[PDB]
Design a protein around this ligand. Structure first.
Ligand SMILES: *C(=O)[C@@H](N)CC(C)C
Ligand SMILES: *C(=O)[C@@H](N)CC(C)C
Ligand SMILES: *C(=O)[C@@H](N)CC(C)C
Ligand SMILES: *C(=O)[C@@H](N)CC(C)C
Ligand SMILES: [Zn+2]
Ligand SMILES: [Zn+2]
Ligand SMILES: [Zn+2]
Ligand SMILES: [Zn+2]
Ligand SMILES: [Zn+2]
Ligand SMILES: [Zn+2]
Lengths: 6, 274, 274, 7, 274, 273, 274, 274, 8, 8
């Protein structure tokens, strides 16, 4: 699962 | 002891809670008929299998987009403003805003139905981006969504009038930073006196940890199918869970607030304009 | 045309499929009463809430283990050999082995019920590790699981007889490499003439890609609650999905194979031995 | 979401 | 059926191919006498040995640049517009543009001979940057290349009129992102009806993969010393290889096109202006 | 080998008129600037009031976005006005007034260089500043003054447009150094004198800059200790005035013959404050 | 309600504290005359300036070691067993061990004076490694320190008798994992009934955090020049700080314990053997 | 003050140079007919195009190998010991060993011809591994190359006799660490009194930097097609370059040494042995 | 070894 | 681009 980064 | 939905209803009615922070997910949009693009049975799915996608999430990956932007724009064509309408949840949030109780609404959805229901942009944090605006991939010029709408509906790849580069809708792709407005949480959650969570398990960070950013005395109301995520693992004394249908639960809260006819009035009026 | 469950059954009965590779997940073990530690409602979950865990998955993280190994050993105590028995699915796989049809069984589970059902270790790939053996965290000395059993059942943290370091069951933690035997897939999947997937979506890598490692002509039978994952996004012509209760589907397949009596007998003998 | 790695 | 060089020429004469995309490398510029900074034997190489460089590539590394910008500006002084002239290849590409056939020219070179030969910037993608423009390292102000020309030719480090920071030519250094205009490939390669590759092996990504971004029906003509790279590894039915001297092959294509006289006129006029 | 007086005379003869200066915490402790890492100050205690794992966490963005209040405690303590420049600052100021200062690189965030009357163009504030701020959400810039009231009233400054937190332009851990830092590329080769004051030079990339000046250029260290790149790679024209920083600076001021000009300057400037 | 040094002393005399865990740093060894290789003024520092080292700490970096191992072996030659003797603190810890009170001694030092004072290896955790043993860089064979002693004393680089590779002392280099025995902390700190911290600021992890791994009821006695680090930041009710000279504090404690005679005799005998 | 090939020859004959370190690359093996798998025109290349390789180098990538090990074994089958013979250079190095002059030979090649010429393994550093031995990918058991030879020659994928996992030749794959023996460079290069570089540009690390690891007075003799790499960029006063064909240069040196008869005798005996 | 420049 | 075998 990929993530848009904070 | 433990609180009920009605307790929350009266907390709202005395307006002792006038700084409500709301977090919503995909569930609240499934009653609007928003197709799950990863799951078979929708036309979007069929249309998307025509391409060389290794997995659904690749539609939100830049390397694939620059290799072939057509799948993403298939999705964009499907979800562009107009094709779908807000439902009772969205309009409940709208009424929450109209009575001056809504501090901020954090959304993971990209259907943009929060705006369509009449919630001002300043009240929204669209954490995964939006189709309302676009940016050219080459020269970075900003454009309103409308500017490319035609191109999108005609299965044409939108190109910039200046440099002819691909104009990409402002949807946040994997690897890209979350929108700037997300940082509003820094001030929003310490200020909240009520937390509302709708149609999302909130299993993925940074939202998960945001569920614990409100003060310990602050009530957390979950309206979802299941009780999972940080709310299950770290329960608090003033938590309330309305498990079951999201629409039905919302309807229950609306009735308990005594806003039901005001709500149907609102829905009548708002559906009238579309 | 497209294949049915009975078609696969007949393929097996006709000896057209005699090199079956099976991949299983948590779904096949819940009928054995195995509690999901992530989901609230189980006693295990309750016991795990006692600790300063940020999220359940932290019990399989080395930093947390070295901070406080007791939550993990709560889990280990719960799932240690003896407390739970195999169900009809496990014994179906056993029968598959006995008839000389099982090439390899890849498991994501750590309940060790595949072993209890009588499938030889050479036929198993326990991809997330096992409680059958343990390793000292300091001097790396190996120990049979039995060796620490007493300590584990007495809520004592097992310490090495040599250096007094913590002895940890050979369960694979997050970040740790998968067991070596996993690499057997390199030879197992090109040889398979049937792929069987039970009680797991196989949605997370490296398991996801393995569903495509079999030849294009090879049937893939999914017996699961939902049709999601790599079989949903990239369907093949000879794929079969038995959605619904896993136990029910397995029993249906057993009947279609005509193995019901052999099964009742097998379960009689093996439950009899326990 | 953490994983376990292939060597 | 296999295609010949003459077939391509006839395709161009009939304007069945009028959207030509071109990719060029170091090969097309060595007839102009452009010294390889990596190879011994040139005055540039000798001048570069003057410094404490661990390897040539360090002239394109930012830490070294900020440690000592003089080597890079030695290179810049050597390759700055004026010192070298375009050759027959460049002018062939120029004629290609003048006749309305050039969709885009992607170059790995930094000699700027594409610009000098008269190809407009909008038709160019200078993938490793250019000396045509510069940027201040401190306040990020843009400057035309000419603006720092004097300083560069007087062995002075160009400083910004505003904050006095070093003004650096827009050459892409190692580690730095490729220019924005590179992303034009997203729209350029699907639109191409002819792919032309001159003087490059295309061994380095992302250029290697771009050779496959054109449609399968689109001819790929290689004019290079050797047949290597993706064109060799993944050949297509409509590929054409003109192996041997780049100048020679280009001249051959020019003759087959019947542009030889126009070419002579063009080269004479343009050499006349210099 | 060279002496302090030799350097003084070099400046007096105007043989050195392009002086580059590097300063650290040492020059500001005589002004009473509290070390937030060290116990015993009210600042330390006030910071102990919050859920910090360690003091340095006030300069970490994840913690800041978790709770910006500890940082603003620090900002309130160190904000312009609360503290006055000392003799070292005014010496650097005088250096600027006589047209001798090429650039002053500072690691401090007390902003005392500005207060002492050194123009922003002569400064490189390598760890950032309270003189300007940026909204964390919409990236709008604001003068420090614009948020002063809020900071001095224990309020978290919020943007007038989008209400996001407005954060002072202090460099946090992990963040890039300010753009102006790259001026070193041109400043250090141009220097004819390097002055290092009140800093151990333990932190890169600031340390290595001491080796960026030409070999013929004198490096004068006024610090408690002879450590860092100056100790490891000594050069023939290095000078170390070890001991108290204020005392060493005063000695140099006397050797320059600037003592009265200095007393007058301090009189006027302290008078205005 | 605070505890005094005498309170701790009495706790030890009554043996209410019989599982003492000790953490020590550079401070306890400077009375032995151990030179700081980082600080100018020592012969070690001077000797290290002879090489092309960018900074002293580079002697503990593997790329520099494999480039030139001679600086490190300069250090090893200086700190090798024999050249220095333990002082009062080491022997206090030795006496602590002899009276059966020492659970474990965690050291950051590499002078090996804990071993020389007669504390058994099993009681030690040498967290930065040791000169007592060495490992060949090529074939990984272990060797006792004596095996290379001669070589080290003759400024010769020790080579393996089997494969002739460099034999490197078991000092932990930068980037390298801490020794396995470090993990003993997992069991040692929850079991401790007294924490002793001598001659270290403990600002560097993972040692800093270990100070908080003991139970809340456990006294933490710091004998150091300053009160800084996690004990300053997170004070506990049962903390005791003996600030000032380390030797003086240790001697004070020994006197309060009434071990002064046993101490002078122990030092008498042990210095007698040395 | 420049040196000649003859100067080096006399240096060797006089044994002023008796600790020679040699570095070799692909250049020394092409006279043996070793095909480049990267270059089109060989049967190996053609055979390799049959598979789903994105590029040739993918043969030395573990993910692809575990996806499909057959291409790699195509290469292995082609290069397995026996199929090719050493040439004059290999035998020159062998003679160098026999006369007691060879300190170490570092090779980037995987043809294993240094070993075949009769140079003992201890004198070798096979930096990219070898086909002479293999390791099982699952249980890590070592095997002599011969043990799998049959399987390799029959286009069968070698399976471990114990666990049936793939047995892989000890070729170093991309991402994998260089062999342990590489670290011998630490002692070999300071000890060298002559550096011999054959059939390699040495433009790739870590070999490039090794050229500067010898002491400054030590002669570096390059026998190569071109003068490029670290020897071109950082020349030393005692460098000698014998540019041109490798075989020609080596034969020249052999004659200048007066070893021609001994050489032909050696070649006769050794080709006789095969 | 060689260095690249990155596609973003 | 090119791939390396890593030095340890
Ligand atoms: C990012 O994860 C977005 N594109 C996913 C939506 C479907 C919420
Ligand atoms: C790794 O993710 C394992 N240990 C989790 C179990 C639930 C199989
Ligand atoms: C990157 O590789 C550029 N800057 C180098 C040129 C000389 C091609
Ligand atoms: C690694 O780069 C090796 N295995 C490739 C050969 C061609 C030397
Ligand atoms: Zn544009
Ligand atoms: Zn042990
Ligand atoms: Zn500028
Ligand atoms: Zn703002
Ligand atoms: Zn060895
Ligand atoms: Zn094996």
């Amino acid at each position: 699962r990929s993530g848009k980064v904070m | 002891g433990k609180l009920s939905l009605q307790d929350v209803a009266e907390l709202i009615r005395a307006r002792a809670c006038q700084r409500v922070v709301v977090m919503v997910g995909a569930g609240i949009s499934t009653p609007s008929g928003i197709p799950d693009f990863r799951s078979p049975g929708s036309g979007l799915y069929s249309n998307l299998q025509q391409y060389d996608l290794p997995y659904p999430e690749a539609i939100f990956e830049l390397p694939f987009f620059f290799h072939n932007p057509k799948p993403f724009f298939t999705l964009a064509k499907e979800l562009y403003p107009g094709n779908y309408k807000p439902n009772v949840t969205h309009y409940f949030l709208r009424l929450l805003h109209d009575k001056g109780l809504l501090l901020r609404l954090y959304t993971q959805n990209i259907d943009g139905l929060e705006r369509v229901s009449g919630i001002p942009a300043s009240k929204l944090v669209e954490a995964h981006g939006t189709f309302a605006s676009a940016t050219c991939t080459v020269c970075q010029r900003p454009f309103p969504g409308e500017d490319i709408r035609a191109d999108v509906m005609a299965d044409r790849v939108p190109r910039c009038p200046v440099c002819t580069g691909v104009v990409k809708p402002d949807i946040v792709f994997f690897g890209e930073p979350l929108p700037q407005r997300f940082l509003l949480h820094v001030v929003d959650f310490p200020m909240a006196d009520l937390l509302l969570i709708l149609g999302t398990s909130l299993e993925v960070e940074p939202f998960a940890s945001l569920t614990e950013a409100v003060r310990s005395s602050v009530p957390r109301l979950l309206i979802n199918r299941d009780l999972v995520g940080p709310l299950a693992w770290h329960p608090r004394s003033r938590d309330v869970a309305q498990l079951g249908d999201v629409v039905h639960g919302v309807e229950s809260l609306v009735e308990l607030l005594g806003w039901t006819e005001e709500m149907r009035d609102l829905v009548q009026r708002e559906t009238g304009k579309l």
